[PDB]
Amino acid sequence: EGVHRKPSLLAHPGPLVKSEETVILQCWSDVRFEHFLLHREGKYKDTLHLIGEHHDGVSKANFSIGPMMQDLAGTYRCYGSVTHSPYQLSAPSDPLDIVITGLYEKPSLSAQPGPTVLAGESVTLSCSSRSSYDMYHLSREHERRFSAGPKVNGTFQADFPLGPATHGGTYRCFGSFRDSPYEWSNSSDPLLVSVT
């Protein structure tokens, strides 16, 4: 593959960014790109530029998205520039969704058939709130989503079957409204699933 192949893009410490905190979006490639561009698409399109950094193994640029605000949430792609003046850009990286959390009250998160389960048993996690969230998001310690179940006993809930229990994990849950999919509630209380 040529020098126009896409770089990589990751968030440190991760893509779910609490309101007013900072995240580092890192672009990297073994290609010795002299510059990187980070593009946020959508309602608040923006483009940032950083000279490339070359350490052993990797050429990188560390974009800090600071004071997390709703206009910073959305889909990020990034590009390497084979050149300096007019940019001659590589293919875009895979897109990366950066969400702001902490804007609404936390949902509840529970394990239908109990949270400590024998290996083999199927288990459902359920996200429920009495706020009228449109969508729920389940993340094992990051992005799995289901639509809300409209006004039943007044709660809105979405159920995530985890299938027959192999390894387990720690799960959190966030709610969201259809028109701003990158703007999430507080995290639910984390649920530890034990597969004994």
Binding site: K43, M69, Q70, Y104, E105, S129, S132, Y133, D179
Partner: protein, 273 residues
């Protein structure tokens, strides 16, 4: 009843850059603070002497609050375009009014927290300071988001605490003008309309609490009909003007009287041409 009221306006201007954001604050009928996003190096600015000495921390955090609210409005306007399925080509206006009424016993009498979009009611915090009234189905989205955010509890703590406590402080530091009513200077002028009639104009000038009543009377009787009255207008120096006029048969001028009622007069005034 004393009051403190803040007014915020954001106007999007497609192609001409980011929205224009303007905010002003009043104690009663006295502007005391201002913020304009178009000014060179914009910051909160005093407009009354009794906030000029609040110190640099006060003025710095007000300035930062303004700047964050200007950008919060930019997202809000973008959301509103989405809610109403509006293109990015039109100009649009978001207005927010927030404030306090004290009353004689000087704790919160009434809170206000309400919005308009393109000149129309959008959403309003109800007199109960816990629930909202949405004007249309777009504002029902905002209501749903604000119930999920527990916003009403933030507005309410501001209205019952901060807003009341700082109004009381402004009334004390500015008591020499905010709580000393400036009485109107009054006179009646006479403009012949013909040979059989003339216009008597009763004038009130330079009064500060803008509330005032000018009533023309004929032999003591209120001349409701036939009295032309202008809207109270700012003189430009913090005081207000108002006149009331009446068409009288020339010769009968002196059975007409002007009754002036104003907080800066111990007794109402009766005057004549």
């Amino acid at each position: 009843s004393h009051s403190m009221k803040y007014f915020f306006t954001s106007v999007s201007r497609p192609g001409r850059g980011e929205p224009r954001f303007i905010s002003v604050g009043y104690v009663d009928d006295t502007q005391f603070v201002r913020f304009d996003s178009d000014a060179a190096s914009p910051r909160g600015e005093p407009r009354a002497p009794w906030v000029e000495q609040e110190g640099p921390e006060y003025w710095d955090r007000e300035t930062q609050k303004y700047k964050r609210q200007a950008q919060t409005d930019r997202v809000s306007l973008r959301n509103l375009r989405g809610y109403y399925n509006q293109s990015e080509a039109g100009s649009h206006t978001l207005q927010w009014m927030c404030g306090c009424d004290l009353g004689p016993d000087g704790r919160l009498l009434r809170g206000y927290d309400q919005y308009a979009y393109d000149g129309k009611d959008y959403i309003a915090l109800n007199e109960d300071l816990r629930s909202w009234t949405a004007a249309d189905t777009a504002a029902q989205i905002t209501q749903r988001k604000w119930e999920a955010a527990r916003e009403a509890e933030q507005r309410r703590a501001y209205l019952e605490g901060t807003c009341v406590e700082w109004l009381r402080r402004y009334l004390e530091n500015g008591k020499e003008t905010l709580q000393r009513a400036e009485h109107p200077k009054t006179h009646v002028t006479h403009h012949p309309v013909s040979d059989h009639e003339a216009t008597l104009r009763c004038w009130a000038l330079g009064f500060y609490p803008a509330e005032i009543t000018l009533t023309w009377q004929w032999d003591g009787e209120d001349q409701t009909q036939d009295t032309e009255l202008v809207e109270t207008r700012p003189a430009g120096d913090g005081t207000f003007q108002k006149w009331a006029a009446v068409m009288v048969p020339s010769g009968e001028e002196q059975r007409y009287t002007c009754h002036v009622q104003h907080e800066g007069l111990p007794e109402p005034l009766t005057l004549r041409w």
